[PDB]
Design a protein around this ligand. Structure first.
Ligand SMILES: C[C@H](C[C@@H](C[C@H](C[C@@H](C[C@@H](CCN1CCCC1=O)N1CCCC1=O)N1CCCC1=O)N1CCCC1=O)N1CCCC1=O)N1CCCC1=O
Ligand SMILES: C[C@H](C[C@@H](C[C@H](C[C@@H](C[C@@H](CCN1CCCC1=O)N1CCCC1=O)N1CCCC1=O)N1CCCC1=O)N1CCCC1=O)N1CCCC1=O
Ligand SMILES: C[C@H](C[C@@H](C[C@H](C[C@@H](C[C@@H](CCN1CCCC1=O)N1CCCC1=O)N1CCCC1=O)N1CCCC1=O)N1CCCC1=O)N1CCCC1=O
Ligand SMILES: C[C@H](C[C@@H](C[C@H](C[C@@H](C[C@@H](CCN1CCCC1=O)N1CCCC1=O)N1CCCC1=O)N1CCCC1=O)N1CCCC1=O)N1CCCC1=O
Ligand SMILES: C[C@H](C[C@@H](C[C@H](C[C@@H](C[C@@H](CCN1CCCC1=O)N1CCCC1=O)N1CCCC1=O)N1CCCC1=O)N1CCCC1=O)N1CCCC1=O
Ligand SMILES: C[C@H](C[C@@H](C[C@H](C[C@@H](C[C@@H](CCN1CCCC1=O)N1CCCC1=O)N1CCCC1=O)N1CCCC1=O)N1CCCC1=O)N1CCCC1=O
Ligand SMILES: C[C@H](C[C@@H](C[C@H](C[C@@H](C[C@@H](CCN1CCCC1=O)N1CCCC1=O)N1CCCC1=O)N1CCCC1=O)N1CCCC1=O)N1CCCC1=O
Ligand SMILES: C[C@H](C[C@@H](C[C@H](C[C@@H](C[C@@H](CCN1CCCC1=O)N1CCCC1=O)N1CCCC1=O)N1CCCC1=O)N1CCCC1=O)N1CCCC1=O
Ligand SMILES: COc1cc(CCNC(=O)c2nc(-c3ccccc3C)[nH]c(=O)c2O)ccn1
Ligand SMILES: COc1cc(CCNC(=O)c2nc(-c3ccccc3C)[nH]c(=O)c2O)ccn1
Ligand SMILES: COc1cc(CCNC(=O)c2nc(-c3ccccc3C)[nH]c(=O)c2O)ccn1
Ligand SMILES: COc1cc(CCNC(=O)c2nc(-c3ccccc3C)[nH]c(=O)c2O)ccn1
Ligand SMILES: COc1cc(CCNC(=O)c2nc(-c3ccccc3C)[nH]c(=O)c2O)ccn1
Ligand SMILES: COc1cc(CCNC(=O)c2nc(-c3ccccc3C)[nH]c(=O)c2O)ccn1
Ligand SMILES: COc1cc(CCNC(=O)c2nc(-c3ccccc3C)[nH]c(=O)c2O)ccn1
Ligand SMILES: [Mn+2]
Ligand SMILES: [Mn+2]
Ligand SMILES: [Mn+2]
Ligand SMILES: [Mn+2]
Ligand SMILES: [Mn+2]
Ligand SMILES: [Mn+2]
Ligand SMILES: [Mn+2]
Ligand SMILES: [Mn+2]
Ligand SMILES: [Mn+2]
Ligand SMILES: [Mn+2]
Ligand SMILES: [Mn+2]
Ligand SMILES: [Mn+2]
Ligand SMILES: [Mn+2]
Ligand SMILES: [Mn+2]
Ligand SMILES: [Mn+2]
Ligand SMILES: [Mn+2]
Lengths: 180, 180, 180, 180, 180, 180, 180, 180
């Protein structure tokens, strides 16, 4: 093809993030060269998940997102058959060994209130913790339990607003927002 | 030869783990290409020991397992002639500088209760701490003192159940369980 | 799934070869975990192509195989619009800057005579050079022009027979041969 | 040219520090080969900023100094539009996620009291924290809040006095002091 | 700013090429973020020079392009005061130790005949060899002496046409051609 | 020459430790090939100092030992002119930023009581803290303030007894002990 | 144990050479700590083989020595079933793709004439080329065909005499010579 | 001390060159901080020797310069007891396996004719080849046999004149020339 968004995504995100996002879309029958808005979203969600796991202790989180579907479900079964928690219907993003619960990370271009409403509607397993971030700097989690420290979450939202600025500077933000 | 277990072991474990396990069996007159079930067990026990030492403080543990028999006993003598603890009859796996005791790590495919019964029967030195893990997610230690934090131990059992799933997915689990 | 061939492929070939083969099959809607015979073939063809380009001078060959379909065709157009050769109907494997022709590399489990007959039947552009290798140690090229030196080609066939031996040692050769 | 200060700067500071300082001066139309005193000052200020961020927690500080003017302001806007603090008139050096304020780092060859008087006079945004260091071993911060621990600040001043000694040993300190 | 050409340049060329081009423009008071067409040209000319020096023997070429103006002239003086050749009026790109002459590399978007006419008009020192490349695949050198082997030059023009295709695929080729 | 001690020292200690010890002896007009007992002692003292600084916080210690005499004294002057402590008569080994004092590390083959008696007799500056270790597992520090945690010191003495065992295993311990 | 030869071997040879020699002896039920003379010989023979393969073209030699017995025989079968040469009775050291023959490398402490007499007596396959080196600087090969260039062989014998000097300098040469 | 020459030497030469030169002077009881002119000369002679060995084939030269006095003489004895050449009275710089002779490399600030006259007067062994270079671009060797190709020698003299220019640019050339 030849989109501005694709070149910006490769310039904005770490190369391993781009490769993992490409593998995730190709596993789900998606092309980064055509669905470039989803390409930027999957890269953003990937980085947010990794910065999230970077916060806290060393052995606190088990990273579910970023693995292939078979191995991700294998780790989920291992975590469930070990601690005793219920197997979630859909694949979560992380598992907290400190709080003993799965975490679903969300990144939205609209109000954080609407996304969780759809995220909580889909996620039937109420045990799975939900934590939403927005590109405007807002966040909200289940039971107001934000899991990480304030500084780690502040670093996440700062990065999100930086991605938003870089997108608007090259005039891809408008098409990126009205596409979720 | 040409066993499925040998190729799975090389694909499942870190290369340095495989090399250390090979050296340990060859030091005891064992061939990984024929005794592939023991090959997978020595790799599993090696990784569990290293994840165990990864938990806790930086200078907490001295790693006895993974060294050659002569150097491992040299470190054991050094630890004994320093702190003043009794020299164990058999080589332990770790030494805890925080609790001032040797640690014997066990990984079992049967009930954790039976192994320790044999492990405690062999280990005459009652000072040596014993900590057993199972592939089903169970654990138990001497005096109910589990040494590490809950998250580090939970990560160990999750990995053990993942190895069990990968083994059963390729139909090596049955021959691996009824072989201990 | 859980196939012996998949674990052998990951143990036999270089990791970057495995990743490039995975991307090539996923680009063509193929799963390495199910089509493990094709997984071993695409890895073998990939390595043969890279050893082939390793023979000769430094700037002799342009590597077409291993790139994504869009970039591979981009390099082919560049080579054609530069030297003046005709654009081949299908994607070749290499381009020889010394002989000024595209090269199609083939690896077969049957007689080398049959494959080229199908390869030359498909390849309408007679300018594209064809070079076939077999797992038994045979080779043959267009116009009896074998391009590389004898030692580089001998190293290629030696590797092919080593892959064949390792496959038969674990009893995957029979299913691999009667699958082409 | 051919100044002793330029060769000392390249020998005294880390290579990446020298490259970042060169880019900062060239961005502001300055030549390190002629303004060698400013070359040593920008390297010193750069290293002090990086040692400052090295103190404290992992996610505590966002490093503003060292980036290009456009990206530095992009991060500042991100931090402001996230936490809600006021946009400073001039570019600060760091942002504290723990104290929720921007930090302006200063390094002086005169009394620390005079510099801050000029630094606080320029910085209209009173929210921005100011922290001055001197080459004699003195320091002072806004509201007597020195942000970091005593050991991290002591390491900073020790390095500053070491740079001063190395400068005087080669007879560049006198021209470096009477040049601020 | 926010140009498509800038993100494509960072995605198309090697990172060290981009950094060297940035330093060359900033040394001459030029901004890559605004003069993005010149940004792509200086990166292209830089890579062509490095591929050119990559052809031939190990100690054949001395690379003049890519150094700062002071050090580049220092190497030119060294070469002149050693071999005895005349000092060129303007900075050349390479020096051939085999042919004992300086080389001026040119990359053009128009006919190679016009550029050399301007290049030979500017270069008063007739000893300096001139070698022009075009994005269409044409080349021509002084006295029809093309210095390198055919394969090394063919690789250069293939890369040039690949850059041209990638530019046209994202619709920057038209503005890049009508800008020389 | 050709001593067993020299080959054991190179096999027992880290290569950078050996190089730093060689530079220290050559700076004081000493040859490692002839004074091999001192070679083993300077390597042992070097490693103990580095393990000592490895204990505690990140910015706690400034490492004086291991630098050249001029730079070591330069750091000592920097520390003194910063904190305000008195300049010691002889070069110490470390500086504690937490306790604000210099540390003199000693390793002995005799009773720890005798060495400190000579160490405290030489060190006139009573502010400098003294910490002695022995190859038998004993330690003692000024004012019974052992600075580090018990685990870090236990790791130091364990290493010392391991060096003693390796020396006696090759029959260099007797000549090493009766040589201090 | 505690031998001077073992520490000298670890100090004299490259670490990977030492590891490969250890694996070769342990595969044949041999201990480097007790049979230290054989330890030095297997390291010497290993290095000579690798320097030998280092001479000549890039794809000239296939390295048989240094692999495990199963994989070494697998490569030998591949070479035989490819070129058509006869399978040797015992494992050779190299294969020459240029001369199409296996090479048996020998290193001796006695006269080169006696070793080959035993080497040629054992090696029934007359096709296998034999090339002997001595620690005194002598060499001789089958049919006076020395395979490599004079400089590569001269470098091999120079290294052999250097190992001999280092051995005699520490008084292990006498026990090493009267032990073959 | 604090000399301009010392900082220029560390900035001009590769770090390993500086370390090897420091070890050579300290082995001969010389201080780089005081004899900075000799410091620059030993670095220059070291680099010239390494560029000289870089010319030619892979196994052509054995590097004598840069080793410690004991190991350098050990290699010289090995070369003599192997090829059969006479042991030189003083340590040479290289050995040519192609021409079968030792090489003495010289770098001078005066006329190349005078140095060799002293070099040939000292070197009694007429077999040792002598090759002198100057900072003005002149060279001359024994029997007019310049050993290497013209391009490799031209690269050496170009580097020498570059070092001369950098020295004069900072006003150390005059004191460096009138000091030989
Ligand atoms: C473990 C490995 C990759 C991890 C992903 C994650 C990446 C991590 C890298 C760190 C270092 N930082 C931080 C600075 C830049 C950098 O590089 N961060 C965190 C921030 C962004 C980033 O990049 N982590 C965490 C453990 C170590 C590691 O690398 N992943 C991928 C999915 C599963 C998983 O655990 N794995 C595992 C197998 C495949 C693979 O690749
Ligand atoms: C010290 C060294 C090896 C250590 C073994 C152990 C390995 C450690 C590596 C870490 C990093 N991680 C974690 C992520 C992947 C990785 O790589 N972990 C822990 C988890 C799995 C793993 O691999 N550790 C601990 C100290 C540093 C180190 O590497 N061993 C081997 C036996 C004795 C010993 O202390 N030694 C010592 C001499 C020989 C040798 O090899
Ligand atoms: C260029 C790069 C990868 C190349 C593929 C190829 C791999 C090469 C690696 C060499 C080194 N050896 C040899 C010993 C082990 C090793 O590692 N060999 C040859 C033998 C097997 C192997 O692995 N080559 C050749 C140039 C350098 C390089 O690496 N490819 C991939 C497809 C296109 C291409 O040119 N590229 C290009 C962009 C993406 C990428 O990855
Ligand atoms: C992130 C990266 C560079 C960082 C600058 C800073 C450098 C850091 C390096 C550490 C490791 N240490 C310590 C020992 C020697 C060394 O090397 N320290 C701190 C002390 C001196 C030093 O050097 N840090 C902090 C995060 C990791 C890193 O490297 N910078 C540059 C400006 C913005 C920024 O965050 N970035 C970001 C994009 C461009 C770039 O280069
Ligand atoms: C010497 C060094 C940089 C060189 C530039 C040039 C780069 C070279 C790198 C090679 C390896 N390849 C090839 C594959 C990818 C890669 O990386 N190629 C050639 C092709 C593209 C490329 O990148 N070369 C040549 C010598 C070694 C080296 O790296 N330059 C920069 C200007 C002057 C100079 O000689 N220098 C010198 C001082 C500053 C610096 O950086
Ligand atoms: C800073 C640098 C070297 C330091 C010496 C010291 C070495 C440190 C290395 C660590 C990593 N570990 C631990 C595992 C193996 C290893 O490697 N440890 C500690 C244990 C043994 C060891 O080796 N440290 C501490 C800071 C980082 C570093 O490396 N030194 C040398 C004298 C002054 C000094 O600060 N410097 C400074 C300039 C010259 C030089 O070399
Ligand atoms: C291929 C790899 C190892 C090779 C052994 C051999 C080692 C080679 C290393 C080179 C680089 N140099 C030279 C300077 C120092 C160094 O390091 N040289 C030659 C001189 C001494 C030395 O060390 N070679 C040759 C190919 C690349 C390589 O490394 N071997 C081991 C047995 C089989 C084999 O081919 N393999 C293969 C699989 C296991 C393994 O380890
Ligand atoms: C072998 C090793 C060091 C060698 C010295 C020499 C250095 C060589 C490095 C090359 C790569 N290049 C070239 C580009 C930059 C670089 O780095 N060049 C040549 C040009 C300048 C330079 O630096 N060579 C040659 C063989 C490989 C090597 O590195 N030496 C030191 C004295 C004896 C010796 O053979 N050794 C041997 C044991 C101690 C040690 O260190
Ligand atoms: C939709 O196809 C996929 C599927 C996967 C595997 C699991 N996916 C997630 O877990 C996940 N997906 C999204 C997302 C992103 C873009 C468009 C729509 C959605 C719903 N957002 C999340 O927050 C999140 O956790 C990976 C990548 N793409
Ligand atoms: C049995 O030969 C060996 C010996 C060693 C050295 C010391 N071994 C242990 O310390 C150890 N061995 C086992 C184990 C594993 C497989 C079969 C039987 C046993 C008892 N399990 C442990 O938990 C454990 O600590 C290493 C490897 N193999
Ligand atoms: C078939 O889907 C693909 C397609 C590609 C891209 C281009 N492919 C080739 O160029 C190519 N393909 C084969 C091959 C391998 C397995 C089964 C059938 C065939 C015909 N053999 C070759 O020799 C060869 O050059 C890559 C991978 N898989
Ligand atoms: C003046 O041109 C520049 C500008 C920048 C970007 C932002 N600059 C700072 O933020 C900054 N500048 C100094 C400084 C240093 C030398 C002379 C005068 C001053 C005022 N001192 C600081 O403490 C400080 O934070 C970087 C480099 N040079
Ligand atoms: C014009 O400012 C500069 C100057 C330099 C230093 C030396 N420059 C060259 O040597 C050189 N410059 C060009 C070029 C590129 C874009 C626009 C105009 C020109 C004439 N083309 C070449 O072929 C070439 O050799 C580096 C970068 N920019
Ligand atoms: C003897 O046990 C082994 C066996 C192997 C595998 C194959 N061995 C050889 O190929 C080989 N062995 C020697 C050698 C060395 C010491 C003592 C006796 C001999 C005969 N010398 C060679 O030249 C040579 O090629 C490796 C190591 N040790
Ligand atoms: C003089 O002390 C040393 C000795 C060595 C070991 C062997 N030295 C040489 O081989 C050598 N020495 C010089 C040189 C350099 C400066 C002043 C005087 C001389 C004669 N010039 C050479 O060309 C040369 O080959 C290394 C370093 N310094
Ligand atoms: Mn997810
Ligand atoms: Mn999610
Ligand atoms: Mn054990
Ligand atoms: Mn155990
Ligand atoms: Mn193909
Ligand atoms: Mn093909
Ligand atoms: Mn600033
Ligand atoms: Mn500042
Ligand atoms: Mn130019
Ligand atoms: Mn040019
Ligand atoms: Mn000391
Ligand atoms: Mn001390
Ligand atoms: Mn052999
Ligand atoms: Mn042999
Ligand atoms: Mn010399
Ligand atoms: Mn010389």
């Amino acid at each position: 093809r030849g989109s501005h968004m694709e070149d910006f995504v490769r310039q904005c995100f770490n190369p391993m993030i781009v490769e993992l996002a490409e593998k995730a879309m190709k596993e789900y029958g998606e092309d980064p060269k055509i669905e470039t808005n989803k390409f930027a979203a999957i890269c953003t969600h990937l980085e947010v998940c990794f910065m999230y796991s970077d916060g806290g202790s060393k052995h606190r989180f088990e990273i579910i997102e970023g693995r292939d579907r078979i191995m991700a479900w294998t780790v989920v079964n291992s975590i469930c058959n070990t601690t005793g928690v219920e197997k979630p219907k859909f694949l979560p993003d992380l598992y907290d060994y400190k709080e003993n619960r799965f975490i679903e990370i969300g990144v939205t271009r609209r109000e954080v209130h609407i996304y969780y409403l759809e995220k909580a509607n889909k996620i039937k397993s109420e045990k799975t913790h939900i934590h939403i971030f927005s590109f405007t700097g807002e966040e909200m989690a289940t039971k107001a339990d934000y899991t990480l420290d304030e500084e780690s979450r502040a670093r996440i939202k700062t990065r999100l607003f930086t991605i938003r600025q870089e997108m608007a500077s090259r005039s891809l933000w408008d098409s990126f927002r009205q596409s979720e």
